[PDB]
Write a protein that binds this ligand. Structure first.
Ligand SMILES: CC[C@H](/C=C(/C)[C@@H]1C[C@@H](OC)C[C@H](O)C(C)(C)[C@@]2(O)O[C@@H](C[C@@H](OC)[C@H](O)C(=O)O1)C[C@@H](OC)[C@H]2O)CO
Ligand SMILES: CC[C@H](/C=C(/C)[C@@H]1C[C@@H](OC)C[C@H](O)C(C)(C)[C@@]2(O)O[C@@H](C[C@@H](OC)[C@H](O)C(=O)O1)C[C@@H](OC)[C@H]2O)CO
Ligand SMILES: Nc1nc2c(ncn2[C@@H]2O[C@H](COP(=O)(O)OP(=O)(O)OP(=O)(O)O)[C@@H](O)[C@H]2O)c(=O)[nH]1
Ligand SMILES: Nc1nc2c(ncn2[C@@H]2O[C@H](COP(=O)(O)OP(=O)(O)OP(=O)(O)O)[C@@H](O)[C@H]2O)c(=O)[nH]1
Ligand SMILES: Nc1nc2c(ncn2[C@@H]2O[C@H](COP(=O)(O)OP(=O)(O)O)[C@@H](O)[C@H]2O)c(=O)[nH]1
Ligand SMILES: Nc1nc2c(ncn2[C@@H]2O[C@H](COP(=O)(O)OP(=O)(O)O)[C@@H](O)[C@H]2O)c(=O)[nH]1
Ligand SMILES: [Mg+2]
Ligand SMILES: [Mg+2]
Lengths: 431, 431, 431, 431
């Protein structure tokens, strides 16, 4: 079998991860004590992908939780599934870093990481075929970005041939919930780009819109938001955990989604998301699903794909459905809206099918889009970045941590070039 | 005795194999436990207890697929070592399938094959099942063939392959993998049989009059074709055709060896009751563009050679009459050919698989066809390649696995020549 | 064997067909399930189980009509593909039936027909049923005939058609569609049989002595006529008449080929008991204006040719005597003709359909008649056309479908000539 | 099958629609929960015309409800069938427009429509063959006319080949229930004419007369008035929903009712309308029905057809009756009262028959008349319009919304020409 290491970093990362593991355990019949009470042999058969059968019937999700300070991971341990985790996988310091990327990637993180990695190594040692790593982190967070970035680099150093992917939480185009976002985010990306093999962009902003609209919710609690995200994450690796018709290994996804290194940012989506108040007025067909999947309004990343083109799209389906329906339906999309796809690439769609549906959803699908419209995000960031940077805003909170100002200019350089790259391909033509 | 070794490679190869062996057992009365509660020694060997053991090797770097087999209905029909699995798949990367991953398995595979071959009294050849585009199917098979041809330079090398249909999807990096394989395939394969999933869907829709088909019955259709071919060896007929004769009667020029296939009379019981499926009727159906298993309107080119395989209740003279009519139908043939029809007749009528979606008939026709029309498909493929290659999309995934960039150029060059070959053949040689 | 293909087009064509095939089954003892618990191979084919399958093609752009058939009593008598439906009808618009809608179906239809024709050992001809004025009947048939005549330039092309009766309604745009069809019909049809619903109503009222008739029994009357004609092929007679001979014996000048029809002796059992239906009696009835199936008082013109079809208990000599009397009845005939009577005799008496409103008789006469009197009807039609065309009423409905305005002029021109032709024929050629 | 989209707009439109759907659901055995409890297979068989089988046995009428403000649609949702509708098809804003056409077609509607159409598109996407659109709206209403008009234009833009028809509520010749009627109505018509393919005119005024007289009612509640209207609407599409003898597709009706584009206004009628107090003194015959249908007093449009001529009349019958009765009876009407029909067109009557009667009415019929007398209405409007316009009455409530005064003069121009057109044809003669 192939194994995945799940690393969680930062308050956000840990909170998301907590929900993630809840979801995964649920799907495999694992209760809060780590005891197996599933119904299908499949649940157990390939459980190895995530859990390490410790002893008896106790399974221990191979996850590592990291934070610079307590009060977060603590709450995780106090929660429903706190006891499912092995204590020794909780690695944290006793200092904060109020969204101080420098601290997270230097003066504080440099100490903490000395541990962390040791645990990582141990976990990788227990694996038979290390599929890769998953990092749940939030951009802009002193830990999430600081440590996140650091760890990524350090891991590739020792596992250059493994697939690394992360589910980053990006900056919001609307109200920012931090002050020094631009800086932290930019600094992270500066290195992220040159490391992680693929990364997903999820924006709370977009998620709120979905909730208030599509889900008809009025109290979009972070727990609910995380739940939604978790669902997406689980979909991504369903192909590893369960049998299907067209299994798509994590690596495979990278191959059909990244055309050029560096250009590996994705917009995630998910269907169906019908509110309970209207579920009875649905059909739940392959067409219905694709309607949602390609609906700009269901993009979990706060960008409007309508203004860009897709370099490539992956569609992973779960449950039951015909091959005919899927393929034909996906074709129709490309044909009807050909202007939204990059002419350089014939067949801009990768599909996959697993025979195991989400609990309660006979049909479900995830959407991974590599749209050039993501450029927009980076553009926004760069603009905000230079606005602050040229005024030297708050730079003393980075300089004071031993950060060289030049690092910022380098970071910008990478960022701007990223934008340029997308812009070039955006309108580059075959002839 | 005439013996044959089947090889199933990759998701498709294996999954198709499942359908095939399911069928073989049915036709020979073999029960899932290898039991037979006199023409078996071609595909089956006898063990100490008399138990039947099919003669095939399943290879798939993605253990998931094989595990389905290992835990499936027919898990009792395979000698464990016939089910060879890897730890990580090729991620739709020919280079992984050929150079970096498959490289480490192929030794085992060949050894197993050899041992199987050593059980034979007279090996006719091999039947390789794979898909273009599949990192394993495409990449690994390339490697496999390369080495099989060394040990068995005089054995028939037949293969069936899924040809990335013009308008379908599944993977993005298809045309790369496809061509890369073709480039090597041409130098080892004796005859490949092209099948399009796309075309089959159309058939399911119009002939079977069904909707929502999956590989669970798409493959069943395919297995009928396979059976039809090997039925010659397995049952007495008026005109038995040994596998070797397919070279002679299909290929007229080394490099060209991609027959298309069809199968009549596909039909639901609903219509069966209202339609007399005469020999002539069926024969005509085989030449109706609509019923081809490959998305290629045969009228665009000319026929080079056709081979008809009749099963069940047929009468030589009636068959001849039907063919004569076909010749009259001013269906074009190249001047290089004056006959174009080689016909086999097997007494054993078609069977039907319990729970299948195909009505049982008293007679059926499988047709293999070498036509210049296929050049179109090749052109389409090459075109797609050119577009992606120009920008070098996804190329780094291959280069990172040790592939030479120039290797792509090489392959393309050869493909150009191939297309040209077809053009030359259809020149209508005249003084 | 003498074989015949029936084609039913549009509401009328199909609905009439229902009555016809109902009757055919009855006469041959065929049960709704195609069962026969030796003259069938003309209209019926034998399937593997022996089941009978009528030889006809039903075409109707309005799926509703066919659905009635598909879910009706005789749903077991048709090979699914014989029931061809569209998605949207022609809305009484010849242009839709011919140019824009029918265009997309006709290919299918012809293919199906061809396959049916290929089952024949000797096709005599076709029997097309349609209505003038019906967008499908009128428009589509026009197209159909245009192409049938190409593939089958030597087969008999007979058709039955509902001729927009002088004083009835149903549709407004009739005279447009009617003429438009006629304009093309003249160049492909071998012989058309005119029937007026109006006339039939009169017959129902006076001969059947009933009231409140619908198509459910109006068509039954019509089917009797059809049977009478084809009975020649289906049963032995003293004087069998092959379909081909109807050209020779009805048409005396290409462009003129619109026989009228009648059928004696229509009558209720009430009167049957009180009346001796002798050969002579019946024969006389056929020439009584009142009993014609077309609203055209034959006394206004002269007869060009008559054809009598006797069924059941008749005696050649008695028949001759009756005819001689008819000749005496100073009923006018054109000088161009010296005989005017071609007579067929079939031994198989008329039957009766359970639940019908027509008494069973021991003998009956169907008469076809080519007369110059029909010119009146044509004039009426043309007149109506002129009135509407002048203002260009409803013309935009045709032009919007790609019809050329000048096309109307063209058609009218030809119609003028047609009328003139009749005038010339009735000139009473004399030195 | 063919599908119809039912759009409801404005308070009136929605209230009518509510009743409409009640009626339709009743006819198809659909209860308030959307569950099917019909008796005949026909009810379900062609239910697709209006309802979209969501899931299980729940059918969702494909209707879209639109209003500029709540308090209307809300009450609909609070009603008996509120839950039968899919919440997502309720599109409304939060602003009014006190019969301010400008707002409805500009400053307010221009915002709302951006949504609306999206829903329309979705609904059309779910269709297999989009028959067309039906709009229920009221002239003079800020929403009904404003949005109504807007939507119509926008739809044709994307569905130019579909049949669009509306059931407008027109101004009353007597007491007006609005102040700025003339303006709103005229402005709507100005565009309506050049868009909608056919439209029906229903006037509350006339309806009241019918109720007090024919129906012997004393409490003509709007619900009752709407019921009557609904009945008419359902009759119009019975041919699509049910089998019959002469099915008349919606498109067909347009073809035989509109002789010239622009001239597409109709006066609806309905029979029988006998009061329960006297139903026992009726015969219910085809003659009885035609007596009512051609009775000026039963015209649902407030005009007196006696003063004009009919360009064309459609008569749709439901239930059981003979073809003979119908045709002959309709003929009699034209003959006896030939002066009331336009001499330009022979046969001014189109007929249709469906075999499915209204619940409780063995025989029923709808009447659609294209009378030149409708001119009267437009004349009245124009006169009132200029009376106000020349005084610049209330124009500031339109000018202030960005409306160009010139639009009014253009509107008038169209209106006056409409009148002229009717007047020309009114007395235009063949010679
Ligand atoms: C294909 C990828 C994709 C890009 C486009 C343009 C796609 C195309 C189609 O979906 C596949 C639209 C679709 O067919 C519909 C019309 C039914 C519909 O869903 O369109 C949206 C608006 C549309 O953007 C205008 C949407 O937001 C969107 O994203 O559309 C309103 C919605 O109300 C119910 C409904 O009317 C991005 O992932
Ligand atoms: C034909 C289309 C038609 C036009 C006309 C003129 C038609 C002709 C006939 O109906 C078909 C009249 C009819 O035969 C009757 C005499 C029995 C009768 O119904 O006439 C009306 C008055 C008449 O107008 C005078 C009516 O209003 C009307 O509309 O009549 C009183 C009524 O009291 C019971 C009764 O006496 C408009 O749609
Ligand atoms: N007809 C048919 N086609 C299949 C089946 N499975 C996969 N395919 C087709 O095969 C192609 C994909 O190749 P796969 O065989 O899935 O790939 P693979 O050989 O497993 O290689 P990797 O997964 O890349 O290691 C696509 O064109 C699929 O549509 C099957 O069971 N039947
Ligand atoms: N005798 C008879 N006449 C019919 C029947 N059905 C329709 N008609 C006549 O046929 C004419 C109308 O043509 P239809 O056949 O209904 O029209 P259609 O061919 O379906 O064409 P569209 O409906 O316009 O697509 C009218 O003169 C009707 O009286 C029938 O069953 N019997
Ligand atoms: N979706 C989501 N976002 C979160 C959550 N907790 C914090 N955030 C977001 O993460 C960012 C703040 O970073 P955080 O992880 O708390 O800081 P850190 O501990 O220094 O990494 C902000 O954009 C928050 O909106 C969560 O549970 N879910
Ligand atoms: N027949 C009928 N007319 C109505 C109904 N409700 C309002 N009306 C009429 O519609 C017109 C007023 O327009 P309304 O639809 O309420 O305004 P809107 O909401 O701005 O479109 C008046 O002529 C009313 O008599 C109804 O339920 N039935
Ligand atoms: Mg695989
Ligand atoms: Mg029709």
């Amino acid at each position: 079998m192939r194994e995945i290491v799940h690393i969680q970093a930062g308050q956000c990362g840990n909170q998301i991860g907590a929900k993630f593991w809840e979801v995964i355990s649920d799907e495999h019949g694992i209760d809060p004590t780590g005891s197996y009470h599933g119904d299908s042999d499949l649940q157990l058969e390939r459980i190895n992908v995530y859990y390490n059968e410790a002893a008896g019937n106790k399974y221990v999700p191979r996850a590592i939780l990291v934070d610079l300070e307590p009060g977060t991971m603590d709450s995780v341990r106090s929660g429903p599934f706190g006891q499912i985790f092995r204590p020794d996988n909780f690695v944290f310091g006793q200092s904060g870093a109020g969204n101080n990327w420098a601290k997270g990637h230097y003066t504080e993180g440099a100490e903490l990481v000395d541990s962390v990695l040791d645990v990582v190594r141990k976990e990788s040692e227990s694996c038979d075929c290390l599929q890769g790593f998953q990092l749940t982190h939030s951009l802009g967070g002193g830990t999430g970005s600081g440590m996140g970035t650091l760890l990524i680099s350090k891991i590739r150093e020792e596992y250059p041939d493994r697939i690394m992917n992360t589910f980053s939480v990006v900056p919001s185009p609307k109200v920012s919930d931090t002050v020094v976002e631009p800086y932290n985010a930019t600094l992270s990306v500066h290195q992220l780009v040159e490391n992680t093999d693929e990364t997903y962009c999820i924006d709370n902003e977009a998620l709120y819109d979905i909730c208030f609209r599509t889900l008809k919710l009025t109290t979009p609690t972070y727990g609910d938001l995380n739940h939604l995200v978790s669902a997406t994450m689980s979909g991504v690796t369903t192909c590893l955990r369960f049998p299907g018709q067209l299994n798509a290994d994590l690596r495979k996804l990278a191959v059909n989604m990244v055309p050029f290194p560096r250009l590996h940012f994705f917009m995630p989506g998910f269907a169906p998301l019908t509110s309970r108040g209207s579920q009875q007025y649905r059909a739940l067909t392959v067409p219905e699903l694709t309607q949602q999947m390609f609906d700009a309004k269901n993009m979990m990343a706060a960008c409007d794909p309508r203004h860009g083109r897709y370099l490539t799209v992956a569609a992973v389906f779960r449950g039951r459905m015909s091959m005919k329906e899927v393929d034909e339906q996906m074709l129709n999309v490309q044909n009807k809206n050909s202007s939204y796809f990059v002419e350089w690439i014939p067949n801009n769609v990768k599909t996959a099918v697993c025979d195991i549906p989400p609990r309660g959803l006979k049909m479900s699908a995830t959407f991974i889009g590599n749209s050039t419209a993501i450029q927009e995000l980076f553009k926004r960031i760069s603009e905000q970045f230079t606005a602050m940077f040229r005024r030297k805003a708050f730079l003393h909170w980075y300089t004071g941590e031993g950060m060289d100002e030049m690092e910022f200019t380098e970071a910008e350089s990478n960022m701007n070039d990223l934008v340029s790259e997308y812009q070039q391909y955006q309108d580059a033509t075959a002839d | 005795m005439r013996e044959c070794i089947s090889i199933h490679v990759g998701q498709a190869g294996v999954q198709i194999g499942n359908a095939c062996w399911e069928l073989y057992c049915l036709e020979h009365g073999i029960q899932p436990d290898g039991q037979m509660p006199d023409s078996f020694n071609t595909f089956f060997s006898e063990t100490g207890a008399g138990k039947h053991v099919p003669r095939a090797v399943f290879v798939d770097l993605e253990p998931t697929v094989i595990d389905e087999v290992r835990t499936g209905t027919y898990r009792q029909l395979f000698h464990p070592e016939q089910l060879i699995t890897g730890k990580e798949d090729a991620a739709n990367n020919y280079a992984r399938g050929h150079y970096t991953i498959g490289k480490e398995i192929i030794d085992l595979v060949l050894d197993r094959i050899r041992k199987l071959a050593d059980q034979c009294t007279g090996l006719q050849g091999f039947l390789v099942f794979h898909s273009f585009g599949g990192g394993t199917g495409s990449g690994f098979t390339s490697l496999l063939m390369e080495r099989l041809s060394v040990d068995y330079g005089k054995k028939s090398k037949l293969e069936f392959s899924i040809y990335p249909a013009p308008q379908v999807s599944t993977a993005v990096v298809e045309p790369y993998n496809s061509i890369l394989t073709t480039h090597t395939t041409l130098e080892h394969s004796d005859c490949a049989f092209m099948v399009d999933n796309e075309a089959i869907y159309d058939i399911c829709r119009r002939n079977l009059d069904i909707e929502r088909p999956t590989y669970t019955n798409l493959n069943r259709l395919i297995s009928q074709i396979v059976s039809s071919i090997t039925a010659s060896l397995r049952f007495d007929g008026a005109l038995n055709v040994d596998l070797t004769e397919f070279q002679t009667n299909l290929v007229p020029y080394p490099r060209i060896h991609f027959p298309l296939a069809t199968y009549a009379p596909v039909i639901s019981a609903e219509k069966a009751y209202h339609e007399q499926l005469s020999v002539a009727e069926i024969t005509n159906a085989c030449f109706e563009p609509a019923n081809q298993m490959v998305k290629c309107d045969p009228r665009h080119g000319k026929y080079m050679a056709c081979c008809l395989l009749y099963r069940g209740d047929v009468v030589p003279k009636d068959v001849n009459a039907a063919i004569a009519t076909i010749k009259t139908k001013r269906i074009q043939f190249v001047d290089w050919c004056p006959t174009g029809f080689k016909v086999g007749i097997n007494y054993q009528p078609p069977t039907v698989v319990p729970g299948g979606d195909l009505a049982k008939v008293q007679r059926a026709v499988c047709m293999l066809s070498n036509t210049t029309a296929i050049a179109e498909a090749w052109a389409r493929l090459d075109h797609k390649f050119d577009l992606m290659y120009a920008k070098r999309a996804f190329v780094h995934w291959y280069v990172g696995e040790g592939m030479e960039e120039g290797e792509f150029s090489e392959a393309r060059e050869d493909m150009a020549a191939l297309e040209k070959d077809y053009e030359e053949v259809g020149v209508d040689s005249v003084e």
